[PDB]
Design an enzyme around this catalytic site. Structure first.
Site, short mmCIF file in Angstrom:
data_model
loop_
_atom_site.label_atom_id
_atom_site.label_comp_id
_atom_site.label_asym_id
_atom_site.label_seq_id
_atom_site.Cartn_x
_atom_site.Cartn_y
_atom_site.Cartn_z
N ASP A 288 -12.16 -14.05 4.76
CA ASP A 288 -10.70 -14.20 4.70
C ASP A 288 -10.21 -15.27 5.67
O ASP A 288 -10.01 -15.00 6.86
CB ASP A 288 -10.02 -12.86 4.99
CG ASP A 288 -8.54 -12.90 4.69
OD1 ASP A 288 -8.05 -14.01 4.41
OD2 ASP A 288 -7.88 -11.85 4.72
N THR A 289 -9.97 -16.48 5.15
CA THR A 289 -9.46 -17.58 5.97
C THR A 289 -8.03 -17.34 6.46
O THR A 289 -7.60 -18.02 7.41
CB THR A 289 -9.52 -18.90 5.19
OG1 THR A 289 -8.73 -18.80 3.99
CG2 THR A 289 -10.95 -19.22 4.83
N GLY A 290 -7.29 -16.43 5.85
CA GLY A 290 -5.97 -16.08 6.31
C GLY A 290 -5.92 -15.04 7.41
O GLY A 290 -4.84 -14.73 7.91
C1 LIG Z 1 -6.92 -0.70 -1.63
C2 LIG Z 1 -5.47 -1.10 -1.89
O1 LIG Z 1 -5.28 -2.43 -1.47
P1 LIG Z 1 -3.72 -2.98 -1.22
O2 LIG Z 1 -3.19 -3.57 -2.44
C3 LIG Z 1 -3.81 -4.32 0.14
O3 LIG Z 1 -5.06 -4.93 -0.03
C4 LIG Z 1 -5.25 -6.07 0.77
C5 LIG Z 1 -4.50 -6.18 2.11
C6 LIG Z 1 -4.71 -7.42 2.99
C7 LIG Z 1 -5.65 -8.50 2.54
C8 LIG Z 1 -5.83 -9.72 3.42
C9 LIG Z 1 -4.49 -10.49 3.40
N1 LIG Z 1 -4.16 -10.73 2.03
C10 LIG Z 1 -2.86 -10.39 1.45
O4 LIG Z 1 -1.96 -9.91 2.08
O5 LIG Z 1 -2.75 -10.73 0.04
C11 LIG Z 1 -1.69 -10.21 -0.72
C12 LIG Z 1 -1.20 -11.46 -1.68
O6 LIG Z 1 -2.19 -11.56 -2.58
C13 LIG Z 1 -2.68 -10.09 -2.82
O7 LIG Z 1 -3.94 -10.02 -2.78
C14 LIG Z 1 -4.36 -9.02 -1.58
C15 LIG Z 1 -3.25 -8.44 -1.14
C16 LIG Z 1 -2.10 -9.28 -1.60
C17 LIG Z 1 -4.63 -11.84 4.11
O8 LIG Z 1 -5.72 -12.50 3.64
C18 LIG Z 1 -4.79 -11.62 5.62
N2 LIG Z 1 -3.52 -11.05 6.18
C19 LIG Z 1 -2.64 -11.93 6.98
C20 LIG Z 1 -1.95 -12.95 6.07
C21 LIG Z 1 -0.88 -12.24 5.21
C22 LIG Z 1 -1.32 -14.04 6.93
C23 LIG Z 1 -0.31 -13.45 7.96
S1 LIG Z 1 -3.68 -9.47 6.81
O9 LIG Z 1 -4.56 -8.66 5.98
O10 LIG Z 1 -2.37 -8.82 6.88
C24 LIG Z 1 -4.38 -9.72 8.49
C25 LIG Z 1 -5.89 -9.78 8.70
C26 LIG Z 1 -6.40 -10.02 10.12
C27 LIG Z 1 -5.39 -10.21 11.27
C28 LIG Z 1 -3.93 -10.15 11.03
C29 LIG Z 1 -3.39 -9.91 9.61
O11 LIG Z 1 -3.25 -10.36 12.28
C30 LIG Z 1 -4.22 -10.32 13.24
O12 LIG Z 1 -5.58 -10.42 12.54
C31 LIG Z 1 -6.41 -8.39 1.18
C32 LIG Z 1 -6.20 -7.17 0.31
O13 LIG Z 1 -2.76 -1.74 -0.67
C33 LIG Z 1 -1.42 -2.02 -0.45
C34 LIG Z 1 -0.92 -1.25 0.82
#
Ligand SMILES: CCOP(=O)(COc1ccc(C[C@H](NC(=O)O[C@H]2CO[C@H]3OCC[C@H]32)[C@H](O)CN(C[C@@H](C)CC)S(=O)(=O)c2ccc3c(c2)OCO3)cc1)OCC
EC number: 3.4.23.16
Lengths: 99, 99
Positions: free
Chosen positions: A25-27
């Site tokens: 996860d690059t984000g």
């Molecule tokens: C089993 C059910 O799953 P679910 O749907 C949620 O599942 C997921 C939840 C999170 C992710 C990863 C997340 N992707 C994400 O938000 O993507 C959204 C949009 O596209 C969809 O695809 C997946 C979800 C939707 C980012 O890559 C990374 N994030 C930050 C980023 C937003 C920049 C600020 S971060 O995770 O918050 C985070 C990680 C390390 C840290 C930090 C913050 O700060 C310190 O270090 C992938 C799947 O349940 C709902 C409750």
């Protein structure tokens, strides 16, 4: 190797003597893993994303292996909906984005 | 280009004729931008991140240029903490992970 992004970039990791599946996860600044009872001390932390913040336990100097590549760094453990390998460890395995 | 991950992979994007900064986010299925005015029809949608679900406006077939590379795809607009470019557009610009 090269990973395309048609599907989620899921890989097998080895941490604390266990194998798990995690996203490259690059984000993600930090690495966040599902609840697991790792040994040793930890510090509370809060991390935020879409939807708000969750509470996690910060463990330092944790050894992780990602596709045969070894790394050591901070791992956050908590009720995360997904295991994400963040930049703190992706840099250590030499991972880049390319287009 | 080849982008290392010691810092956040932030790039300039052009959408709706306007320039913005966004994060290349291999952990995001979808592309989510902060509140902004975009022309065209939209539909309300829900998306879930690490902290829970948020309400967004879904814009389909939107032109968006990412670091000099054109894409046309779905863009979600809502209260995300940062602009994220997700896999739906990363694939369009030919982006891969490599290590
Ligand atoms: C089993 C059910 O799953 P679910 O749907 C949620 O599942 C997921 C939840 C999170 C992710 C990863 C997340 N992707 C994400 O938000 O993507 C959204 C949009 O596209 C969809 O695809 C997946 C979800 C939707 C980012 O890559 C990374 N994030 C930050 C980023 C937003 C920049 C600020 S971060 O995770 O918050 C985070 C990680 C390390 C840290 C930090 C913050 O700060 C310190 O270090 C992938 C799947 O349940 C709902 C409750």
């Amino acid at each position: 190797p090269q990973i395309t992004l048609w599907k989620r970039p899921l890989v097998t990791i080895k941490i604390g003597g266990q194998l798990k599946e995690a996203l490259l996860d690059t984000g993600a600044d930090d690495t966040v893993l599902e609840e697991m009872n790792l040994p040793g001390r930890w510090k509370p932390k809060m991390i935020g994303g879409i939807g708000g913040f969750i509470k996690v336990r910060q463990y330092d100097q944790i050894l992780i292996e990602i596709c045969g590549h070894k790394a050591i760094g901070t791992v956050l453990v908590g009720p995360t909906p997904v295991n994400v390998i963040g930049r703190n460890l992706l840099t250590q395995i030499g991972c880049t984005l390319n287009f």
